[PDB]
Symmetry: D2
Subunit: 225 residues, 4 copies
Amino acid sequence: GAHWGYSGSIGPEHWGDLSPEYLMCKIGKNQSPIDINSADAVKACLAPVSVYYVSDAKYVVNNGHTIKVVMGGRGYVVVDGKRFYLKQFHFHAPSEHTVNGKHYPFEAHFVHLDKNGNITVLGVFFKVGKENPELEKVWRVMPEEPGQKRHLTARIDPEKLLPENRDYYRYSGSLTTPPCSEGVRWIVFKEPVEMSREQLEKFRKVMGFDNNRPVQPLNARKVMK
Amino acid sequence: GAHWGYSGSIGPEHWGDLSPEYLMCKIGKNQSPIDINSADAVKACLAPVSVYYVSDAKYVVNNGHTIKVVMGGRGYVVVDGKRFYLKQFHFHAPSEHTVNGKHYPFEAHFVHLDKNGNITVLGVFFKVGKENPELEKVWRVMPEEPGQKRHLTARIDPEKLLPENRDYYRYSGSLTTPPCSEGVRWIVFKEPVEMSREQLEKFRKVMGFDNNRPVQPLNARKVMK
Amino acid sequence: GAHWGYSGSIGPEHWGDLSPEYLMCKIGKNQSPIDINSADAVKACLAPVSVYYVSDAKYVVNNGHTIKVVMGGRGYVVVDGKRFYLKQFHFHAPSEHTVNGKHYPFEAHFVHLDKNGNITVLGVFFKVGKENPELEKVWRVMPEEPGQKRHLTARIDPEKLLPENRDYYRYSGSLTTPPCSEGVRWIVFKEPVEMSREQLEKFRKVMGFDNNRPVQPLNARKVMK
Amino acid sequence: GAHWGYSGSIGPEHWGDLSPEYLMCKIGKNQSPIDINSADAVKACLAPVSVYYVSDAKYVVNNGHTIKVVMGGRGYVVVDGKRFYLKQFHFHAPSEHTVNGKHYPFEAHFVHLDKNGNITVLGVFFKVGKENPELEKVWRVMPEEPGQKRHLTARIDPEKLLPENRDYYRYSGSLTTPPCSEGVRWIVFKEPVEMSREQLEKFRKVMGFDNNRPVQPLNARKVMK
Ligand SMILES: CC(=O)Nc1nnc(S(N)(=O)=O)s1
Ligand SMILES: CC(=O)Nc1nnc(S(N)(=O)=O)s1
Ligand SMILES: CC(=O)Nc1nnc(S(N)(=O)=O)s1
Ligand SMILES: CC(=O)Nc1nnc(S(N)(=O)=O)s1
Ligand SMILES: [Cl-]
Ligand SMILES: [Cl-]
Ligand SMILES: [Cl-]
Ligand SMILES: [Cl-]
Ligand SMILES: [Cl-]
Ligand SMILES: [Cl-]
Ligand SMILES: [Cl-]
Ligand SMILES: [Cl-]
Ligand SMILES: [Zn+2]
Ligand SMILES: [Zn+2]
Ligand SMILES: [Zn+2]
Ligand SMILES: [Zn+2]
């Protein structure tokens, strides 16, 4: 795939024109992220998303578009009665999803694959408040330059990054970076978690730019709540 | 666009290869029709779909892939608080959608567009029982050869083709013929209506072939019920 | 308690005056049975009612107000996460509950107690159709006179009397015979099962009178569906 | 009816013994208030409760068991498609209802009657925060002694006491003071509003005692959410 970014000639509005591989950015009708209007969402009998994570975080990488924690892939969540294995988690500032037209300052994405390669992403909003103890373990060894990897000696428990309340919005969408492939299950937790002002500012300093894709039209979709 | 059909080298498994315009048949992850597994569908607080149809049928046409009644476009349904205007209705045998893995013998589609060109299709299943009086009005003047159009001798009341019970399944999908464009709202009524064996046989005889696209994978979607 | 019946001076409209013990018949605001208006019922995320019955039917008794099959009490259903043990099942003609103002010709009640004596009744509607094979085992030895008991040599499987579809209406109500105690959980299956005309007529012949309490006002209650 | 209170020999555990008129306190199985366990509540397709209140407050009264604002009865809410007219509102500290086993410091009740005398009570929880401007209008003229009534100097807009978010819990229950009559519709708003510590302390000082009835067992009921 061709080089892409968050501004200039290779920014989100141009992604669909950068490569034939990125065509869904241009033609897709089921794209992510979205604004979640809570009144427009349909109240629904959604199943609990059960979490069976393990502490198998291997390293943290700065890949030039996010900070990503890479996992061994043994932990999983249960969605639609199937195991989706946690491969990695990573971060955006400001939030990619909005709620009633408003951003949160930060959003984490936990990226899972089932045995057939189907993708489920769990989304967690963060607000500025108390220092997040689990996040601090990652932040302490944040790779400051693109291309850098840092081994984790501290034991990261990814379950501790999720909100205590597990209510969520669900919809069918896409990856938020090229090639923006569709057929992705989105589980967006309603309750935000806290990070310190200092934690937010370090991420923003290291990144050096905002890394959220603009919200995309719902089209025929409904969000369930 | 390129010629297509329901069998052989131009059949549904090949549509995505017949024309670059038909790419979504090949790469789409939100395609129609689908199997509706009722246990897998999510019980949800779905709004009533209000129907405000008018008797403005213009003609009936045999277009080589279905029998279609063309409307004036003044009647409408309300979905997501918006007016979707009835442009035409047409027929498939056997059914395109299945329920718990089983076909109905016949399925009608009512095709609507809102003021911005967004598409909603209402689907009505038919089972063999008593002769359908409203269907008979169209069947009496059925154009027997592809390319033929006939004037309607009786007044068509399209709402009389809908089931009395208005409970429905809803999902986001596509058109079921090339180019199989996505972003289509599907409203599939749960209760079937009746047609006579003779009515079904006249349709199958005039058509000369099955005209249902095979069901497509749900992928990330849920059906609401 | 005082003598009561289904007609005359001791009939349902007088039950509240027959004994101080029967006061809830007169003053209760949460009485059973009720008319279930399906449009007025609230669509709700009701849990499956899991059935763990055993074949421990002991005898059938004609107690002068119904025909009742008495169980050993080992089988149970799960409601609100608790085990409610099946103590007995018995019958009414015509139905006690109505649906949209209409009776079924027959209704069975499966009466359960949890470990603290809380009552749950499962209601099954019957319509006239094919002979019911499981019911026939009981009907073959139906005690014809009040006061008579008949031992069951045939092995009754009460699960086979429930509908195959397990969707239900739920509401909070009362026993339908004096003392009409409240705090009773009602689970009324939506789908009826069949019995033969002959089976219905034998029950009605043996009883000699209709044994349904008139429907009672919903008052502050909602039915969930 | 017999004299009753919130403590000692005339307290809530004894109400059912103080008068034959108070029998439901003792024998009722659908009593209020209750603990609302949010996980045990059933997610349901509840209709919005529309509010059409008017500024028709007549006076405020200290009646020896609460502070009550008496209304003209022209304002109303719509529940089950019917108009329930606002007759009065009053206050309890600590809260009568609990949520997940915890009290709020304060609870308001808006008491409504339909044209046939059926009762609906709307409940609003308060937490300590900023001074409540609408509450202050009443608090400024609070009658300090039982039996005293005061005219209202400012115009009372009762809708301004309701939370902005109108999501609610619903159940069927009773009045929370003798005779504790059943058949009462309860609408308990999920979102609390704020009052100052000083506002709460003035209420507790004037009252001289806690005025909440203990929570009552749910028995057969479910709470909808
Ligand atoms: C390799 C990989 O994981 N790609 C992703 N692209 N976007 C993602 S997101 N922001 O939708 O979670 S994950
Ligand atoms: C011109 C037009 O309406 N095209 C359609 N193609 N498929 C349709 S369907 N079967 O999805 O309703 S409508
Ligand atoms: C002893 C016993 O079971 N009493 C009952 N009275 N009414 C019942 S019913 N019709 O409500 O199931 S059960
Ligand atoms: C006269 C009158 O309204 N009596 C009430 N008793 N309890 C009520 S409450 N706390 O249930 O709202 S209202
Ligand atoms: Cl990523
Ligand atoms: Cl480390
Ligand atoms: Cl068509
Ligand atoms: Cl019409
Ligand atoms: Cl009985
Ligand atoms: Cl036998
Ligand atoms: Cl009061
Ligand atoms: Cl007001
Ligand atoms: Zn992401
Ligand atoms: Zn069609
Ligand atoms: Zn019974
Ligand atoms: Zn009160």
